[PDB]
Amino acid sequence: GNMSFVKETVDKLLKGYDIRLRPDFGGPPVCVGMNIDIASIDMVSEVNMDYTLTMYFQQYWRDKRLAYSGIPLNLTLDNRVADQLWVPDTYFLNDKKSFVHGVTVKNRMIRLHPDGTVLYGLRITTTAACMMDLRRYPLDEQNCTLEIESYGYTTDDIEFYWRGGDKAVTGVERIELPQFSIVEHRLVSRNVVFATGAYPRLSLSFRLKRNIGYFILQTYMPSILITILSWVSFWINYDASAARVALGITTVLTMTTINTHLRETLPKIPYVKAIDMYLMGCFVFVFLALLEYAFVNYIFFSQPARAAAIDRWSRIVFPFTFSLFNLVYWLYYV
Amino acid sequence: GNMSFVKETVDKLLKGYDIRLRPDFGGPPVCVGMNIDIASIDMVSEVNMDYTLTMYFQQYWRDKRLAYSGIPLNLTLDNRVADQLWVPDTYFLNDKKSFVHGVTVKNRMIRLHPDGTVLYGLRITTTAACMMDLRRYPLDEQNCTLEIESYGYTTDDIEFYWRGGDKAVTGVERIELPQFSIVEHRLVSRNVVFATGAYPRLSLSFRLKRNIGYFILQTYMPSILITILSWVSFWINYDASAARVALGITTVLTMTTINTHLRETLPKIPYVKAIDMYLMGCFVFVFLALLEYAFVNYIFFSQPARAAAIDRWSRIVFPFTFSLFNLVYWLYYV
Amino acid sequence: GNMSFVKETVDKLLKGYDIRLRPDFGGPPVCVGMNIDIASIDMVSEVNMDYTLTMYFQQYWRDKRLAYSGIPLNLTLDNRVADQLWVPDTYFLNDKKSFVHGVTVKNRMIRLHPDGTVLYGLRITTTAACMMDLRRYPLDEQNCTLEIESYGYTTDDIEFYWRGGDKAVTGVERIELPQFSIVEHRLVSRNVVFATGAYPRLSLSFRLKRNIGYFILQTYMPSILITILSWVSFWINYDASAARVALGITTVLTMTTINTHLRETLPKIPYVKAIDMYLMGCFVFVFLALLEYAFVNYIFFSQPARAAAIDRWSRIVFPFTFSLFNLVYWLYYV
Amino acid sequence: GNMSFVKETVDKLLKGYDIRLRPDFGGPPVCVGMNIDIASIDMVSEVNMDYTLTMYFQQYWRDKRLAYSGIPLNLTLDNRVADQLWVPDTYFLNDKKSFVHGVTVKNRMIRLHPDGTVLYGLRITTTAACMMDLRRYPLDEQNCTLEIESYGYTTDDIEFYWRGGDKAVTGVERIELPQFSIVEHRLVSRNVVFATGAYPRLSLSFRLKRNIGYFILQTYMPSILITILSWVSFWINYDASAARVALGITTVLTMTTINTHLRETLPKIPYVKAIDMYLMGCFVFVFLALLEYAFVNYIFFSQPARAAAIDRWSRIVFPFTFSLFNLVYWLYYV
């Protein structure tokens, strides 16, 4: 309760305190416990292969140089005192753009304990790279990880562990991804050996399952219906050259128009995906449907009996082949 | 009026003043009163699920260490003196990108009072996350909130309240949102219990009702008219194969062209919305209209009497079914 | 000419100088004169409702504490000395993103005078919010203002005025806006009363008239010509079912294609504009033109004499109605 | 070779050195020589009317206060010593976003000479505004300039000149612009009189000639071919109503589709360009081609002899008028 007495204690601790030396320098490595309180996942971008994450990053360790006695209450110092202490050189291995919020003040917390324990919390919005195998898009399951490592110190100087076991990372249930749904998150602690030596490593991975309801209604359904309309020409009198030619080519034109516009809406990733195969697969059927009439029209004059046979056979072969195409497609990717 | 006397008083207050210790450290929590003067809401983005807000954020508390006597006038110190005082660690829970304007100087105000009262104002442009339930888009009502909390101190160390009751937040009437209209704003004061303890919480929520006039004229009206034109083929002589086939497929082509282009203009949110159901609902009718002629054309030769019956029945069934589709659609989402 | 003597004078002025106290603290308010030398207006964005402005912002006031004698020449100190003086807390009320250029050095000027007069110039590129009433777009006239106010001090502590009267703001004639043309700029000085008290206010407003030549050629002209082509079907033999049906629906398809693509090129503002009414107005005529043939075709067999009467009457009613539509449109918005 | 002796010399020079006073304060103006080593021109944006430039900006002047004796070798001090010296307040008049690279260290060089000469180099990536007269786009020649001026000091206090004459600016030959080709660069030294007095001015201008090969193949060629296909209807039997009507309107539809999509690819500049006139010029011919058939079809029944005369005359008038249109277009803009 005595502010002057507390002020003297803090100045005494900081007097002779060297920030360039880790706790227990030259001795056993300092154990650091880390908890993450995830606030939200802002976006998951397939074009940039990254996801934006906002979280409360806390580090828990003990520094004997900061131990104080006589004050039972835990000291909650101002965030500006963190520049005068020693903090682990924790950094994220796969981040691309990370920053600490500073409104109204820097979102930073320093809390001291009588036994020298230090609690250090940060609110960080980081963009972590996540390579995606989008061959089975949009029926794919992604695994995006956040890697935590010490930049300068080795395992002999510092050790990382998840404070709380599997309960170290919270707030996953509150994440609301419009496109994905979180299935499972895992916590991994391991040591990685590099050229300069072993380093502590902490990993936070998510397995994301993409929602398919939007793509079925917006992408797959229009393509199927246009393919169905291409079969209308089969149930048309062969003498109506204008009707079947116009119907066949317009369906090809309609298929191209939807296919080109979807690509612009879809991510700009330049490699073959599951949706691209299906759309080009349907484009073959409308291409074959128009070619079917050309063969019928050419031989209609010479062999009218055979021409009608091809027209009625196409009424079964095309729906049967298309169903087999869907059966192969919807089992290979599911 | 004596500048030298005032200068001595300020230096005396700052002498022995510790920024690392909150007012009444070790005693009752310091009560902080907060008022918000909203300037404008820059944008409300559905793609990023966030809204940009510009406001004058003011904090009101009392620090006995800064109390001075002999000068009746309230001291309006320079903004650069705020770095030498103690200010609450107020931060916004759901913000994404927030900053304080600094042109020409930092938009910051420090005002002192004889009884130790401190007034601290900031002009902050913050981007706050707002998860949106856009299933009923564009006929949806959104509720975006701004959450205020203390990062480090608990309820035992600091307490938050709205200075002025329901009058704490002003400027809502002056907000001009081109797309939304503000219906109601609420002020909520509560304490939230976390792992580290209870924290003060202040909430500022808005309920936004989206305007529909643009979407009715630009999106719903063109789709209805194209659907109406699909019924023109019913009032066409059945022998005109070229006329009805061309009309039917072009309406399907026209429906696809407008549908694909609207999606690019509409937000890239990948899930089913109210507008998507309506556009795909209308796309079924034009799909059925073309299929209706195919059935009529196939049986026209064998049963001309029955074929004409189907053509005239479609003149009533299709308009009646479409009206029922609108009746269900315009009551479910309204 | 004596550098050592000048160096001693500046140090003497800064000795005992308090930046936390305004000139004549506790006395009459300090009058500040402001001139603006506008360099260019970078952009005027309708989507974001803001305009980017680059200008030379200068402030002119007198501080007796900085008065010096013995040196007739005006002192032009380095820009880094501004951090050691007192400058007004001038800020822009409606700015969104503002910064001071710092290449190669900070674009800042401090000039001292023997009578204590201080000249303070800044080169600022600010993005100021400008709400636009785009109902009459693109035939609208916009009024974008830049508001200048003191953040902390009231009218009792500081007063604002335009140094030079109507000549305070220059460089308006040199502004080259590709889309707009500046018609008139006004300077307004007023005092605004808030909860904390009255504040000085300086306003710089522009009235922008949008150019219409681009929209007439690129948007209005194609729509008119397509509407004219819809009347071609009237001068077509009624027995040619394929010709008139194809012409009617393709014009509807052509009207939709241009209408959808223009919206993407046009700003994403979601409310009804003047151009939207005209494009949807023309879309009705092509919709009615196709409906006109359907009525003629249906009754052509039963009453060929009446069907020809409707076809020839449409050759006059449609051009006359369209001209009246333009006459109403081009007088309501002009 | 004696590091201690060199360290003493530098400290002696900085002792008593005032950064707020220019060299020869109160005397003749200090002459500054400037050389530019252009690295690359990143982009030339027509939408934003600016170009991004990366260069090595060096300033050359003499300060007698920094003169040292006894050390023949030129001193190459660390970049962090520039904050302790006096440097000209050089800034770019027409820049929009400029910065100095700071990886790994700040790209800044300070070099001292025994005679007091100071060399000051910076690596700056600046975005300079360049108003473009794009009426003749894409057959236009642009002139983008970089303006150099002193922010605070007048001609009486500082003078600018190009160190090396016409050889001051190098690296122009190494610039690789994908769209433009540099024709000529000029160096201009002049004094500009403002309200506060005369200022030194250095100008670096480029004259850029736009490449036309891409636009000829991608924009002009498709438009010409579609216009040619519109003349196919002339060599079609007049009795084929379906063939000529479909061909005429589809060419109009094809012309609209390419015209609308090009505008989105082309810059969003809202004023008439050379390409816009040509595309709308070709759109008239296809509009007239369809109108030509309407006149022929209407009078074909009454006067078949005259109708055939118009059809064969259109086979010559349209190609001749189109060639004259190109002859006027390709000479007015070339």
Next chain:
Amino acid sequence: GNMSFVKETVDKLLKGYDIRLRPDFGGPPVCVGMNIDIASIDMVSEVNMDYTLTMYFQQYWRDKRLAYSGIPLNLTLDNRVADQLWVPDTYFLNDKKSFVHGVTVKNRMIRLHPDGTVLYGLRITTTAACMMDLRRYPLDEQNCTLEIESYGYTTDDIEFYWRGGDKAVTGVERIELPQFSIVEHRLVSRNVVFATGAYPRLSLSFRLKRNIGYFILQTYMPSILITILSWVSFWINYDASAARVALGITTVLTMTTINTHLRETLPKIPYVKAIDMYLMGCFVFVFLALLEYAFVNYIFFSQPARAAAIDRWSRIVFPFTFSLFNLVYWLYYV
């Protein structure tokens, strides 16, 4: 193990240490060894002609002033001590936007050795300019280089070499480029002579081979199929004017629609590419196919025998010419 003894040693080394003087000032140049541990290549943008690179940049040199004795263990000081030492002025010649990550702390490592050796590591995300010769796009092979040079010091003052020979740069095998595949990387050490003198240079170049699977399926395949459908009109009865005219023009319309939409998806680079020639090459065949029918239709009445000869000859000439076009195209660019 004695923290106080280590603290005294570091302070002794920093006492009298001058950062403005390079090691062995006035003597032999200081040799700097550099290793790069590439983390990932974020993107390779053809529009901006740059690639984003994330790497661990380490510098290895010896400074005798920092040599210490008595402590066998290598000192791993805090990253904040780097501001108090001397580090090479290493910068990247062709970078555009480069920064050092600073979350949670600045990603910087300083390690000292008893023999005065200093290890200095940085984690840098740099955007390096890479001019691309995209004439053969998308069948092109690109060569993007990262250039390393000393900004201020010449070869007489500093020398650069790759520490580890060809093993200096690692992590290339772990790079996952979705569009490109890394073929070979080279390390080059050379001295470049400029106006101010020779400078050390280190180069890291990559040769990237673009994947073609996406472009074959998405771009080349649709164009070929539409060209094939243009040959359908050859196997159509010549009397069917409506069928062949509609098929010919719609294929031209279909070719234009896909061609225009691909350009928007493709990079905005304004010069002729390999893909542009192929798409315009195919557009000629559909243009010639429609022209072929016009010649046949015109002379069908006068010379029916000759008209049928042209129709059957087109069934061979067009497929043969198209195959030769592909044979020339697929050998010139491969």
